[PDB]
């Protein structure tokens, strides 16, 4: 399973 | 901005005149990912050309394998013509059976 990204760039 | 495609044209199995084979056009190390790839027989578009799905390498650059079935003869010429933003003019590389 892939990551869930946190804050945006 | 842009990285210019590296192109190889070659066959799956060792080539033999009159024997059915697969012709590969392998395009690597390009950016941006949008690209136009044509395979040619005697200067004419081969219609039924299979293209692998969008993929990139760990150096971020993109690659594609185009392929088609072909039965080579002594005197028919085969090529791959690639159009990409990094290049002013499309690039044609010809199949060489020894390479």
């Amino acid at each position: 399973e892939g990551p869930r990204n946190q804050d945006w760039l | 901005i842009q990285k210019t495609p590296q192109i190889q044209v070659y066959s799956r199995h060792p080539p033999e005149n009159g024997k059915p084979n697969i012709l590969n056009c392998y395009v690597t190390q390009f950016h941006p990912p949008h690209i136009e790839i044509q395979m040619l027989k005697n200067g004419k578009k081969i219609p039924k050309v299979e293209m692998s799905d969008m993929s990139f390498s760990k150096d971020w650059s993109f690659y594609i394998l185009a392929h088609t079935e072909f039965t080579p003869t002594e005197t028919d010429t085969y090529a791959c013509r690639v159009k990409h933003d990094s290049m002013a003019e499309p690039k044609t590389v010809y199949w060489d059976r020894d390479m």
Partner: protein, 273 residues
């Protein structure tokens, strides 16, 4: 031996709103196993290897939902980046991510990865410590400071040390149904009179990593040697060759060597009429 999992994610904008295209590809041991593409009629994670068809509809729905969130994250980030680089409307832009984990032969986490690229160039990367960030660009500093304050690194550390390893262990158990050794030969080719081309071929091998060398006296002849980049045959295996120009008659003086992880020891060969 060692194992790995990766997720390679891409978003691409083009002029004309419309929204960006988002593609996610999963790999286990450098082989594609799942794929999502927002251009699909009905965008879903799809199995990409037979062994992944084990998973029930609950998996595919969970992962599809995650992909939809990632797609939105990429959209927003792409828009932020346009401002960071003072790029105007009217161009094409690419944002890429690589995430995942390396395990040793003992199945223990060896290394976590979390990298981003903009326009195909390094933007920000989680360091091997999984605590600090590398960011080259002046623009990437804005991001690095934000993510230091937001505690982003701990968030990704948790996924890389936990879920990534956990799920990779699972996938490795589900997938049981390797190396393929190269088969080498030299071909004879004519050249400008006096000289010939001996071309050493390696075929049928997996993984792609391989070395070909020519020797005389010997004395590896790197200088004038010709080669090609390793290429897929299309059947899951790879091809490569190396070649050298050689005086006619004196061809039994040159030896090709082939180095591959599948071999018990390096192959030595030459031209046989």
């Amino acid at each position: 031996g060692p194992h790995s999992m990766r997720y390679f994610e891409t978003a691409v904008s083009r002029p004309g709103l419309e929204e960006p295209r988002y593609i996610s590809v999963g790999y286990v041991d450098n082989k594609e196993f799942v794929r999502f593409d927002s251009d699909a009629e009905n965008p879903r994670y799809e199995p990409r290897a037979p062994w992944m068809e084990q998973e029930g509809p609950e998996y595919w729905e969970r992962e599809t939902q995650k992909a939809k969130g990632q797609e939105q994250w990429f959209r927003v980030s792409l828009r932020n980046l346009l401002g960071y680089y003072n790029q105007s409307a009217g161009g094409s832009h690419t944002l890429q991510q690589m995430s995942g984990c390396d395990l040793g032969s003992d199945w223990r986490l060896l290394r976590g990865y979390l990298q981003f690229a903009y326009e195909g160039r390094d933007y920000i990367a989680l360091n091997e410590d999984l605590k600090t960030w590398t960011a080259a660009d002046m623009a990437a500093q804005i991001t690095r400071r934000k993510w230091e304050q937001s505690g982003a690194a701990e968030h990704y550390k948790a996924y890389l040390e936990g879920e990534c390893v956990e799920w990779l262990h699972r996938y490795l158990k589900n997938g049981n149904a390797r190396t393929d050794s190269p088969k080498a030969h030299v071909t004879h080719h004519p050249r400008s009179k006096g000289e010939v081309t001996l071309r050493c071929w390696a075929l049928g091998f997996y993984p792609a990593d391989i070395t070909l060398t020519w020797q005389l006296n010997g004395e590896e002849l790197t200088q004038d040697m010709e080669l090609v980049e390793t290429r897929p045959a299309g059947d899951g295996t790879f091809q490569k060759w190396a070649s050298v120009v050689v005086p006619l008659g004196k061809e039994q003086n040159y030896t090709c060597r082939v180095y591959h992880e599948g071999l018990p020891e390096p192959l030595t060969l030459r031209w046989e009429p």
